């Protein structure tokens, strides 16, 4: 028998549950978050706000819609009734 | 017990104290008085009765 070891590549961070949390056409309350992220994969739009964690929340109640800032750049927005 | 996990109460803190001179007055809520006759006096003795 032999003896070996020392992998030193055996860890990783805790998974942080990013991505969208509400869907297009879905009704939303005030203050609800929509898209956890890091930096801006997506920007805010109308009646939507960004936080210190680059997270997107609805300032009001309404319905969600995702769109594009012209080219190669996305957006969300809340539109009320 | 939780299998050696630090249980809830120990991981939580204590709060406050108890007074020696506390008064827990007996409470009436003013609708129970309608059972009495008009103009009649009222006393805790009477209520106990």
């Amino acid at each position: 028998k032999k003896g070996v070891g020392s992998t030193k590549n055996g860890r990783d961070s805790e998974a942080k549950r990013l991505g969208a949390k509400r869907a297009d056409g879905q009704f939303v309350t005030g203050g609800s978050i929509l898209y956890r992220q890091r930096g801006t994969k997506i920007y805010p739009g109308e009646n939507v706000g960004r936080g210190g964690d680059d997270t997107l929340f609805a300032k009001i109640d309404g319905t969600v819609k995702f769109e594009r800032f012209g080219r190669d750049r996305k957006k969300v927005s809340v539109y009320p009734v | 017990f939780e299998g050696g996990q630090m249980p809830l109460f120990q991981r939580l803190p204590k709060r406050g104290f108890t007074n020696i001179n506390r008064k827990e007055y007996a409470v009436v809520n003013l609708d129970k008085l309608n059972g009495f006759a008009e103009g009649t006096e009222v006393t805790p003795e009477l209520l106990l009765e």
Binding site: - | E2, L8, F9, Q10, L12, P13, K14, R15
Partner: protein, 64 residues
Amino acid sequence: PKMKTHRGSAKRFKKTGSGKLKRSHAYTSHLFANKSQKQKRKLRKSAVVSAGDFKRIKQMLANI
């Protein structure tokens, strides 16, 4: 023999009108420079025991 009450939990919790258990938070003892004031204002406040924990412990507090 009468049931013995769990005294630490008695010192820590308080009973409510709805049967729920009031509690305090942890992370509120001694080491505050490593925490935001947001946390601290959230944590000086009270809280309520969860359902699972309540199921675990409530027999220890029938006598309050």
